[PDB]
C-alpha cells in the first residue's frame, strides 16, 4: 500500500496473506468470507504470461496476521488448501476482467478476536455504497512504492470510488462493469493506492445503515502504483456474487 498507515490490531480480521511454499515468498492478499472459504484475485493464482499456475499444494493461507514477517504465535493460523476455483471467464489476456478466485480450506478456521469473516454485499448494499466520492478501505502487506519497500506490519489506506467515465478515460485498456476504480485525483493533496503484493486483498466499505463491513472489491490491477491520473482497478464483488454463491453451494 502506498501512502497508507499501520493497521491496528484486529482492525481487518478478515485479511488473509497468501504465501508461496517454494521458494517462500509473500504472494498476495485475500479475505476470509466463512470458516472454510477465502476470496482472492485470479491473477494471484493463474497468470499464463508469467508461467504462473499454482496448485492447492503450492500455497499456504495465513490468517490473523499483523506482522508481515513474524510467525504470530497464539494468534495466526496457517491453513492448507483443499481446492482452488478460478472464474471460468477470467480474462487475463485483455484487461483482467473477472479477476476473482475462491480457495476452500482443508479444515475450518476457528474465529477469534483476530480472525473473523467479512460480509459479501447484497443488491441494496451495492446500490447504496458504490458511488463516486464514497471511500472504501484497502489493506495489505504489499510494497510501499512502485518498484525493497516492504512494510513491517499490515498497512491500510482509504480511497474514494471514481466516476465511471474518469476510470474509462484514464487508461487505453477496455474496462468492463465487472471492475470499478478508486483513488485520489491529481493535484488534490492526498494520494495513495494498492501496490505489488496487495492484489487479491479486499476493498471494504462500512455500511451506515447496519454498521457491518462489506467487501465491495478485490484489488485487481493498475498501471504501476500511485501514479497521477491513474487509478487502482478492483473486481466488482457484487457483480460476480452469483458465481461465488454457485461455487460455495456446489462445493461447500
Amino acid at each position: 500500500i502506498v501512502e497508507g498507515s499501520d493497521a491496528e490490531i484486529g482492525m481487518s480480521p478478515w485479511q488473509v496473506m497468501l504465501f508461496r511454499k517454494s521458494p517462500q515468498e509473500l504472494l498476495c492478499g485475500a479475505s476470509l468470507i466463512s470458516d472454510r472459504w477465502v476470496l482472492t484475485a485470479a491473477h494471484c493464482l493463474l497468470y499464463p504470461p508469467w508461467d504462473k499456475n499454482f496448485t492447492e499444494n503450492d500455497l499456504l493461507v495465513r490468517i490473523g496476521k499483523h506482522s508481515r514477517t513474524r510467525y504470530e504465535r497464539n494468534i495466526e493460523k496457517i491453513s492448507m488448501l483443499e481446492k482452488i476455483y478460478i472464474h471460468p471467464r477470467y480474462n487475463w489476456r485483455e484487461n483482467l476482467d473477472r479477476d476473482i478466485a475462491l480457495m476452500k480450506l482443508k479444515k475450518p478456521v476457528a474465529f477469534s478476536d483476530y480472525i473473523h469473516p467479512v460480509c459479501l454485499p447484497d443488491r441494496e448494499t451495492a446500490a447504496s455504497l458504490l458511488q463516486a466520492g464514497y471511500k472504501g478501505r484497502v489493506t495489505g502487506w504489499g510494497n510501499l512504492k512502485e518498484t525493497k519497500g516492504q512494510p513491517s506490519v499490515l498497512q491500510v489506506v482509504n480511497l474514494p470510488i471514481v466516476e465511471r467515465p474518469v476510470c474509462k478515460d484514464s487508461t487505453r485498456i477496455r474496462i468492463t462493469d465487472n471492475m470499478f476504480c478508486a483513488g485520489y485525483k491529481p493535484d488534490e493533496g492526498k494520494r495513495g493506492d494498492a501496490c505489488e503484493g496487495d492484489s487479491g486483498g479486499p476493498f471494504v466499505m462500512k455500511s451506515p445503515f447496519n454498521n457491518r463491513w462489506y467487501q465491495m472489491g478485490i484489488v485487481s490491477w493498475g498501471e504501476g502504483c500511485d501514479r497521477d491520473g491513474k487509478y487502482g482497478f478492483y473486481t466488482h464483488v457484487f457483480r460476480l456474487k452469483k458465481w461465488i454463491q454457485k461455487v460455495i453451494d456446489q462445493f461447500g
Binding site: 508461496r20 485483455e94 505489488e196 503484493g197 490491477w221
Partner: peptide
C-alpha cells in the same frame, strides 16, 4: 497442519497486477 518451524524476511513476489502484459 503445516509445521510453522518450516518458516522470515521473505521477499514479495513481483505482481502481474501492477505490471500486466496487456500494457506492453
Amino acid at each position: 497442519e503445516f509445521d510453522p518451524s518450516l518458516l522470515a524476511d521473505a521477499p514479495t513476489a513481483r505482481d502481474p497486477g501492477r505490471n500486466p502484459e496487456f500494457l506492453r
